[PDB]
Amino acid sequence: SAISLINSGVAWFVAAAVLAFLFSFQKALSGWIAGIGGAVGSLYTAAAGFTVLTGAVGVSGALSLVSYDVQISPLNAIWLITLGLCGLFVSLYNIDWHRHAQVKCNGLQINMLMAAAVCAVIASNLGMFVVMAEIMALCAVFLTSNSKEGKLWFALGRLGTLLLAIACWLLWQRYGTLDLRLLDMRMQQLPLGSDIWLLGVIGFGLLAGIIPLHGWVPQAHANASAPAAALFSTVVMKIGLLGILTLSLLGGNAPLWWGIALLVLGMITAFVGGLYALVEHNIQRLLAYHTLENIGIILLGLGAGVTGIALEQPALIALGLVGGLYHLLNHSLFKSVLFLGAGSVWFRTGHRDIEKLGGIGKKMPVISIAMLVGLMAMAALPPLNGFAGEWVIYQSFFKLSNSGAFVARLLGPLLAVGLAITGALAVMCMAKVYGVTFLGAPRTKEAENATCAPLLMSVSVVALAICCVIGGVAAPWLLPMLSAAVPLPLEPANTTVSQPMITLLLIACPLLPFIIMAICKGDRLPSRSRGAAWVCGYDHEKSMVITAHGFAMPVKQAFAPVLKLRKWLNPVSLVPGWQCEGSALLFRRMALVELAVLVVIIV
Amino acid sequence: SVLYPLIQALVLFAVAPLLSGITRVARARLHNRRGPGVLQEYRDIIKLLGRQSVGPDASGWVFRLTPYVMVGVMLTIATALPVVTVGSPLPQLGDLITLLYLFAIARFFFAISGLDTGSPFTAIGASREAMLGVLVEPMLLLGLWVAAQVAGSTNISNITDTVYHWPLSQSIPLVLALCACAFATFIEMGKLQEGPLSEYSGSGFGVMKWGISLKQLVVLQMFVGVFIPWGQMETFTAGGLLLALVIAIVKLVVGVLVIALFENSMPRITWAGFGFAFLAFVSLLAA
Amino acid sequence: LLGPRDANGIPVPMTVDESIASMKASLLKKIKRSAYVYRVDCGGCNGCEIEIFATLSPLFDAERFGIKVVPSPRHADILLFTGAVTRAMRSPALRAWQSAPDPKICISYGACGNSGGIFHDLYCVWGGTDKIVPVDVYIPGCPPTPAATLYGFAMALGLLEQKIHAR
Ligand code: SF4
């Protein structure tokens, strides 16, 4: 009954959108209606995804409000599950987010984006996939702050549908069918063709944010709202990744250069995103480059899977796919944690620059603990949920390192070395982020005036962090659940890792020095926190603390050629009409035209 | 399945300031002075445990709670390193990625504790330590990765008994990876004044000294127990245990002595550590 | 702000609480085998500084008795004060006093630190180090010989006893 569940979920999403738009004359009631509708629709979406994943078969039917053909493969059930979780918690966050005198009623665009994303996940036609991913993308463009930020994203988004429309026309000419099961059963006879696959991969990476086509991501995540940016990073990226995965797995056939190309592409995405996140002092733009690097890690897992299905190694396929999809779900979880918590910090303070955002850990300690969990989850630290997917991806890398191929053995340990680079850089970046935001003395009078977080904001972020911890410690019980979608044995190289014993050994081991200091203390006075930091005799000043500007200097010191390569490959001055007076307003003017003419032809 | 890892962690915790004490008395004898005793580190640590911890007003729970976290993370490390058998006490936790990212946990908590205080010196030291971790983690990953693909499995107690029974057919990938791991250990135990602990005081400073001594133990132990296993057991017996403890403490003592000697005998070793690591990686690919 | 004053505003030596000052003997027998000493050089000539740094030199050693020089007041159990308290140096010396964990041991080193020395009655000094902070052990000399420094630290740690008395 997952078809009826997803039908009711899409119905509640569109009802929430139209009711939030109809009652837009006030902010509180419109936000309440939009959040409740999004929450119940996401509950139905997650219920349908869990039903499909537990059935492990795959269901098909017809959505009887668009006349929409639907197939829910168990591979897409993970996308439905993560969309349901993220949508439910972002809607519950939006309930309290829509009580501010500075924010806007975004519930119509939020609900339309989630409905388009769900219809894109559950799509069976590739043309309908493009159309619904294109509805979601224009709603996301409308979901930005102003017309300046949604200009490069509009250009890259329409470049992507030009590419995806050409690829879909090529597929319709070659096969006479746009369906996905029909293409899979027809791709035994003729293989995909590099010309269609590379075009589709570039067109989806324009949507999935793949370096060097990543220029829209931090500009879009510059000053957007946290309910906007959370589902941006956890929906818009994952739809393009789903399109890449459903183009790469369109047949058992898959040439070896596809997997190597995906490995190199996700590799440079992970490295460049993780390096470029270090040199930024805006939290919501830093999270965009960390989106880029974790999407690179998920693409590393998917490229390992594609290389395995090229080399006919079932263990490699199993390891690559579940590592990639588990890291996809976990990344969406803790990225929602990070974006919603940073938005709560902005909600209580008003600042997004971490240079002018210190001392928030004492003002809001619940939010501070939640971001500590999220930062330790994103920088892959055991036993949290960002470590398990990286562990399975490393196991797939080791399976690559032992397979018989010169293109795979040369690429085996290099991916491990660079993923160690990326993990260490992420650990540094989140050490910097937690140090200069939630620790130390505040650096602005606007910071100490920030009271505690609201009720439902804290409830949503704590529930997301609870889900992150649950997905972390219960990885050995959730990985075989994802083995029901990618369907075959998981074969780590003679090794398991067990998150519960690390969890038990990280709470019980620090008790031993506590017991020892409780025994070895004699006349120990109670600990005092009174004075200022020791700065060698002179008194302490606000200009003397080291912050994100001075903490990210040796990475600018040692990784200088890549950061100068940022400035070189920037063809922004070569576009003739890019410097126009009204080009930003013109793109948003045809955006109203394009969404109005493409929605009505579907209906 | 509980007693062996717990006794492993407890003994490796309780023997850690011997290695710091022997290192500081070796540095004293190398500079032609008599120097302190080998038990001076214990006296300093217990005396600091007597004192009471102070900190800045802006410091919160992270500043007080970091040293216990770092000691517990080093204990979770040390409970999976084999010191007397070729089999790790906890093979579930005794992977390669697990140990690396638990060391990443330690680096992250040290860096956020250095940034918690308002002192520029502690934040600078946190940044330098994080730089050191960024430059050393893939070196050691590639070293034990070459050793792992020589072995067949991503797991301690598989690399250890692969290098225990020397195959004599892939000896060059083993030797180059061994020297790369030695270089990574040399970088981690060393640099490669004010200090990053200038804001710690009392019990917090004592538990930081505990954690630093335990980190310097477990890095050298991950070298000399994984890559020098001749003297350990395939299966745990009750009669050959004294020989295993003797050879383990002798290995640790000679390791800290020779590392102190070659530290005082001093991006060359940073590049050569990467260079011997890639020379290991090319060696399997060419042969 | 940092230090107590009179009605005129002249600084006075700090008074520790007796709860804080009650466990000084226990602190001394705790740090008898390991003493962490921070030099707090104030307004004085290098003589009273180089000789203190010569207590860990080849001729006279301090680590054999357990004394180790620390880089921060937070690590310090003994605060070694050196020079006569210059008006520009009272505030950093007070800051080094409050930065150390309670209880503390203070040792005045040299004539200039004990009472001001030759600059005892002068507008830019406050006199000796006892005019700003309490002092437990006084070590005279200008400069004190390293034998006197070792005797002062050993008598502070209880390894030796006081030799000279008043007449
Ligand atoms: S005691 Fe003598 S040597 Fe020391 S600072 Fe005073 S005048 Fe100089």
Residue numbers in the entry:
A (entry chain C): 2 to 604
B (entry chain D): 2 to 193, 205 to 278, 287 to 307
C (entry chain G): 4 to 170
Study authors write:
The structure of aerobically isolated FHL, determined to 3.4 Å resolution (focused refinements 3.0–3.4 Å) by cryo-EM single-particle analysis provided important detail on the organization of the heptameric complex. However, the map density for the hydrogenase [NiFe] active site and proximal iron-sulfur cluster G1 was weak and poorly resolved, which we attribute to oxidative damage. The size exclusion chromatography (SEC) elution profile of the aerobically isolated complex shows two major peaks, the slower-eluting of which corresponds to a soluble complex lacking the membrane-associated subunits HycC and HycD. Our cryo-EM map obtained from aerobically prepared sample shows a Mo(MGD)2 geometry similar to the crystal structure of oxidized FdhF in the [Mo(VI)]-state. FdhF interacts with HycB via hydrophobic interactions and hydrogen bonds (H-bonds) and with HycF electrostatically. The C-terminal extension of HycF interacts with HycB and contains a cysteine quartet (Cys117, Cys120, Cys155 and Cys158) that coordinates an unpredicted cofactor at the periphery of the protein, consistent with a single metal ion that we have tentatively assigned as iron. Arg122 of HycF, which is near to the ion, exhibits two alternate conformations in the aerobically isolated structure: one facing toward the ion and the other toward the acidic patch of FdhF. In the map obtained from aerobically prepared sample only weak density was observed for the ND1 and β1-β2 loops. We suggest that oxidative damage to the [NiFe] site causes disorder in this region, leading to the partial dissociation of the membrane arm observed by SEC. Our data suggest that FdhF is more strongly associated with the Hyc subunits under oxidizing than under reducing conditions.
